[PDB]
Amino acid sequence: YLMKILTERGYSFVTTAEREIVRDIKEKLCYVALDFENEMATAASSSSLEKSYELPDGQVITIGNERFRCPETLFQPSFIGMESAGIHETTYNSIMKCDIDIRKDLYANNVMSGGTTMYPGIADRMQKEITALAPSTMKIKIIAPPERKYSVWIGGSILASLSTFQQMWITKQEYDEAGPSIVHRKCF
Amino acid sequence: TALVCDNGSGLVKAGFAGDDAPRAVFPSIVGRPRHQGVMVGMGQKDSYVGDEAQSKRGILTLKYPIEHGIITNWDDMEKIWHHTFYNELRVAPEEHPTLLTEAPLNPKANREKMTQIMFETFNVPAMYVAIQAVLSLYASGRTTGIVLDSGDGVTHNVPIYEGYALPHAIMRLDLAGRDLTDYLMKILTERGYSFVTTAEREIVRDIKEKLCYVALDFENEMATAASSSSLEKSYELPDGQVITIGNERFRCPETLFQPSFIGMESAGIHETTYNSIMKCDIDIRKDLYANNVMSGGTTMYPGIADRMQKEITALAPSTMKIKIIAPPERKYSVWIGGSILASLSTFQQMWITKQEYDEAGPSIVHRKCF
Amino acid sequence: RVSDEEKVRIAAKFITHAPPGEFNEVFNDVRLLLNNDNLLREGAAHAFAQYNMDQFTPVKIEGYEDQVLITEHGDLGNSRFLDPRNKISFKFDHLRKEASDPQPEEADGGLKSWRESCDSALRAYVKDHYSNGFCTVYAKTIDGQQTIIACIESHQFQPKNFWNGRWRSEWKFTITPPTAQVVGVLKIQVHYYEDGNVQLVSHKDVQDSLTVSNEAQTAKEFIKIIENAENEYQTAISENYQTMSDTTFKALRRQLPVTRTKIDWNKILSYKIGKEMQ
Amino acid sequence: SDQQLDCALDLMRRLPPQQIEKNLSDLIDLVPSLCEDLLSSVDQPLKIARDKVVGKDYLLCDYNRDGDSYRSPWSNKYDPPLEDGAMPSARLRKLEVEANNAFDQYRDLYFEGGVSSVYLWDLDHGFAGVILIKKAGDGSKKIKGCWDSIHVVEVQEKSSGRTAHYKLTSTVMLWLQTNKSGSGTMNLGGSLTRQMEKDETVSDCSPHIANIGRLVEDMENKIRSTLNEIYFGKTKDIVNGLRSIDAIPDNQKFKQLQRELSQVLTQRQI
Numbered sequence A: 001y002l003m004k005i006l007t008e009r010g011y012s013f014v015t016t017a018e019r020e021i022v023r024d025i026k027e028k029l030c031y032v033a034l035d036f037e038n039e040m041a042t043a044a045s046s047s048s049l050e051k052s053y054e055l056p057d058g059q060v061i062t063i064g065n066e067r068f069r070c071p072e073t074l075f076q077p078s079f080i081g082m083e084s085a086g087i088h089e090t091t092y093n094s095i096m097k098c099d100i101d102i103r104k105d106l107y108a109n110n111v112m113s114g115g116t117t118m119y120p121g122i123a124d125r126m127q128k129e130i131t132a133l134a135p136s137t138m139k140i141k142i143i144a145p146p147e148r149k150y151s152v153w154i155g156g157s158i159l160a161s162l163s164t165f166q167q168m169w170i171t172k173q174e175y176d177e178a179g180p181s182i183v184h185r186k187c188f
Numbered sequence B: 001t002a003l004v005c006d007n008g009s010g011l012v013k014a015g016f017a018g019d020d021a022p023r024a025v026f027p028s029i030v031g032r033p034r035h036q037g038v039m040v041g042m043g044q045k046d047s048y049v050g051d052e053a054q055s056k057r058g059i060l061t062l063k064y065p066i067e068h069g070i071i072t073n074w075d076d077m078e079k080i081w082h083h084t085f086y087n088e089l090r091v092a093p094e095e096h097p098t099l100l101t102e103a104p105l106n107p108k109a110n111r112e113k114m115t116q117i118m119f120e121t122f123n124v125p126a127m128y129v130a131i132q133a134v135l136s137l138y139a140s141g142r143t144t145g146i147v148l149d150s151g152d153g154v155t156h157n158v159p160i161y162e163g164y165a166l167p168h169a170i171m172r173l174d175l176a177g178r179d180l181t182d183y184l185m186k187i188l189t190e191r192g193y194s195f196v197t198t199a200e201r202e203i204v205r206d207i208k209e210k211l212c213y214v215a216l217d218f219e220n221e222m223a224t225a226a227s228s229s230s231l232e233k234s235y236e237l238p239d240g241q242v243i244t245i246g247n248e249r250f251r252c253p254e255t256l257f258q259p260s261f262i263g264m265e266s267a268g269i270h271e272t273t274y275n276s277i278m279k280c281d282i283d284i285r286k287d288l289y290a291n292n293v294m295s296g297g298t299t300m301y302p303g304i305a306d307r308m309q310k311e312i313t314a315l316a317p318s319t320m321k322i323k324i325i326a327p328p329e330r331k332y333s334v335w336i337g338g339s340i341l342a343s344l345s346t347f348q349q350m351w352i353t354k355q356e357y358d359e360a361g362p363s364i365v366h367r368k369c370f
Numbered sequence C: 001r002v003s004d005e006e007k008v009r010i011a012a013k014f015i016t017h018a019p020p021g022e023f024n025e026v027f028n029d030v031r032l033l034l035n036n037d038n039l040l041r042e043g044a045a046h047a048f049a050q051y052n053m054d055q056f057t058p059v060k061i062e063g064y065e066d067q068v069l070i071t072e073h074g075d076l077g078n079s080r081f082l083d084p085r086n087k088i089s090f091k092f093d094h095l096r097k098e099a100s101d102p103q104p105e106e107a108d109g110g111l112k113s114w115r116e117s118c119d120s121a122l123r124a125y126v127k128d129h130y131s132n133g134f135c136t137v138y139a140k141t142i143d144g145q146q147t148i149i150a151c152i153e154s155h156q157f158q159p160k161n162f163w164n165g166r167w168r169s170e171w172k173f174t175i176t177p178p179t180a181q182v183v184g185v186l187k188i189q190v191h192y193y194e195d196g197n198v199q200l201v202s203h204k205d206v207q208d209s210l211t212v213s214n215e216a217q218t219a220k221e222f223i224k225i226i227e228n229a230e231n232e233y234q235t236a237i238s239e240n241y242q243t244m245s246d247t248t249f250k251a252l253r254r255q256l257p258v259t260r261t262k263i264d265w266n267k268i269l270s271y272k273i274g275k276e277m278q
Numbered sequence D: 001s002d003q004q005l006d007c008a009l010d011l012m013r014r015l016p017p018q019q020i021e022k023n024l025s026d027l028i029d030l031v032p033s034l035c036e037d038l039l040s041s042v043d044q045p046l047k048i049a050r051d052k053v054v055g056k057d058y059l060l061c062d063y064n065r066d067g068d069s070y071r072s073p074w075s076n077k078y079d080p081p082l083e084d085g086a087m088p089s090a091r092l093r094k095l096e097v098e099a100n101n102a103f104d105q106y107r108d109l110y111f112e113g114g115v116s117s118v119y120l121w122d123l124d125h126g127f128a129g130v131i132l133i134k135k136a137g138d139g140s141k142k143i144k145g146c147w148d149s150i151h152v153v154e155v156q157e158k159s160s161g162r163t164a165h166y167k168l169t170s171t172v173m174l175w176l177q178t179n180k181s182g183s184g185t186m187n188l189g190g191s192l193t194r195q196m197e198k199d200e201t202v203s204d205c206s207p208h209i210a211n212i213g214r215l216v217e218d219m220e221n222k223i224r225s226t227l228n229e230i231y232f233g234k235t236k237d238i239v240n241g242l243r244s245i246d247a248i249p250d251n252q253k254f255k256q257l258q259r260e261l262s263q264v265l266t267q268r269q270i
């Protein structure tokens, strides 16, 4: 989507090598706005949100409001034509499909993981959206660790270093006896 | 000429009282545009109702006004009733009394707002509200028995003795064909098929209506499905792709008998029926066991009568005769019973007219009406 | 063995804990387990009277209608009781529950104008709400002041359908102008034993106040507070039955686990692993 | 003789199901001759003992009793310490530890607390087991009541071991008490007893523990649904049938044309 909307300023990226360049631009320059309409208004009003980036051939590009339109698709999936709800609404629907007595602890222990949760505005925006969706007497805490780009691996090392996980492996003899369908029996 | 309208959670069945079949059967959906309109030589509406939504669902977001039996959106229900009265029946609602249906064990404000909307916006000479399972028993030519009414939003077990429903034994299960469609959408992801959009939900509904069935023995059917590909069936998508399902044909309706498949606390329809029978007095239990009547479209799976017979025979005492009646027209059975009730001679003095509503207000339906 | 006095005491305990309707079966059980008729007929004879005075037993007398209630408030001694409406005294047989010797009795005229006004409205209320309902109104002086006691009873003994039930209600207020305190004790006991066994015992104490005026208005106020207490008690019992499976029964055994699914018995260690990481 | 035993059973059957131990304590001093008879034929709340070696509680019944001592399932030792007691075989003990672990997880998932015990012993061809579950209410969270459950399983093998026959019988005792402002006190208690038989295939994909736990789980869910719907619902109906709002001489005003509608509908159907 950033590759598509970079053509508004005349920057055309086509090949699969240039997709890596656009990904690097997204990792370096994009951020999540707290309020999208006020951010669009202050981007149109003044040239104070623009940033510059240098291409591998030395050319310099500048983006002003593509910085927060690119991760707005996580909150408004209709930008790429998708009918689904945002990540905040998906979180609220996941909490509302649980038991009613455990929703307090689920609302207080929201954990963000992965590389797409590394934009430097996403925790406050998610807090505002969930606090809008949740009832007014509930406490909402969203936890974003600084090392959350590698969090599946750390918990995997924790799980693999445990004494009671050593019986949960799928051994070779079990694969020989049961074929490649025991992974639906021993693994969740 | 009276009007019989069955506003279900998934379909609307409306027609004239006295006919043997409904004249307008259309889906209860409102579609709204999703994309950018670029051509100006076009009709370019903003809301599509019924079949016009289903013929345009690829550029539309579909909404059901009724969710789990209760009415969530009243503007969309107004649109549904307007399309029913003026476009599918071509009638004037100022001249015809209208019979309406309502699921049992429902909030009273739903009936209040139903009467208020039908008397203030679509002004009728008279109106009446009836229970759906009682009409389904009336359409089957009997006055005593238990009705299993499973549709798009609710499943109900209603026992009726001498034309009167027994309200202390009415059982409600919040599982019907919409939950089965969503569970089929969930379990088609195992074979690699992704269905997300509201338009593709109708495709999965068509798949469920076309290919699914009820296994007599679930464990043996899962054993035979994992031994050979004799149960795999193919379906052709609207875009020409061919999908194949082998054991999702009987796992999806098993949520009717094992409701924990979608994460619901209640018991299956067989235990629900046995509980509804067992709450009644002993001298009517023989008549209720002998007169099991199925109703609605969710009872149209081609294995449900034999399975229900086996399970109720297992639950009941061994000296009890179990007979389950599944009429071939049970997709239209509330409407036929409403047609029978509205064409009776003594029913014509049970209409709630407009003058009594003026003298009473939006609370007469709890005293003159059931 | 143990002394016969201890056996009499525990037989009286067994008799006084009998469910409504089931008296003759309990009597048969104790008379077949004790195997001594002479210690049962006279050694424990106040147990039968105490059970009849607690269960609010209605007895149909010869002649007049509206079977009267056997309470401890209308006890005359030598197994005699009184009827405040019929102005009569009779002898009650607890074993066969039979009324005999209906000798006339005369009460003082002070507690008469304040009694019939409450009695007529209480009979109207019991006819209006209770199906098989009986009611009695007593009026007597205890703490230097006359007071009114109301007793309401309804039983629905159906042994062929394997269940019995009983509603009892007692109300009391001391007549003293300009205001008085009403105190009510409400009891329900239900037994149902078709294929297994289930019992319900419940009681509620309600305290309120009312103003004091002429007899008709204070009778109407007494009926009004009785209605507004018992209606809320029955509605609260129904709403408590509505939310049993989510609040109180879930505290003993849940219907489904918190995963909302049945247990995968091939993956017990996968449930056990998740609690070992603080 | 036997008539006295039947009278005692019918006496304590219709006693309130909250004081079963207290009512049984002062019933047995009446006739202390059939004390050994009725204690193997009535249902009682379970007893909790503590294994000091492993630090866990374990339930006491008549299937782990050797005279007066009781065998612990966690440490396989008696308390008080005797010698040459009744013991399972090594295969049976290896089955029993897995059964105790699985039913501990079952008790954690479904009961969220309480004591569970599983005891196994050998038969002529198969093996039998008793599963005891006890849960009392949490006093810190203002819950008063108790649940007791006894399940007896008999397993008969079929030589080759492809399939096996399971027979289950269950007894559940229960009581609850709530104290609320609008309702006062509310006591509800009773007991149910049910049976089940089923033949099932046994392999590496489904051992004996999975089959027994599946049968016990289905039976417990069925008994809980039956207790909530049939019995408490009948009690609610009896309560509503004793006293009624929507007055009896006033609720017949809206049942006048209903009789005419019913009779002309029966005319139409005939």
Ligand SMILES: Nc1ncnc2c1ncn2[C@@H]1O[C@H](COP(=O)(O)OP(=O)(O)O)[C@@H](O)[C@H]1O
Residues within 6 Å of the ligand: B007, B008, B009, B010, B011, B012, B150, B151, B152, B153, B177, B178, B205, B208, B209, B210, B296, B297, B298, B299, B300, B301, B331, B332
């Ligand atoms: N042949 C069929 N097999 C299984 N389900 C069906 C079949 N035909 C219709 N249904 C289901 O019946 C449901 C609606 O039936 P019906 O009771 O007539 O409408 P409503 O529920 O709105 O009253 C639909 O959700 C549909 O999935």
Ligand SMILES: [Mg+2]
Residues within 6 Å of the ligand: B006, B008, B009, B132, B151, B296, B334
């Ligand atoms: Mg319907």
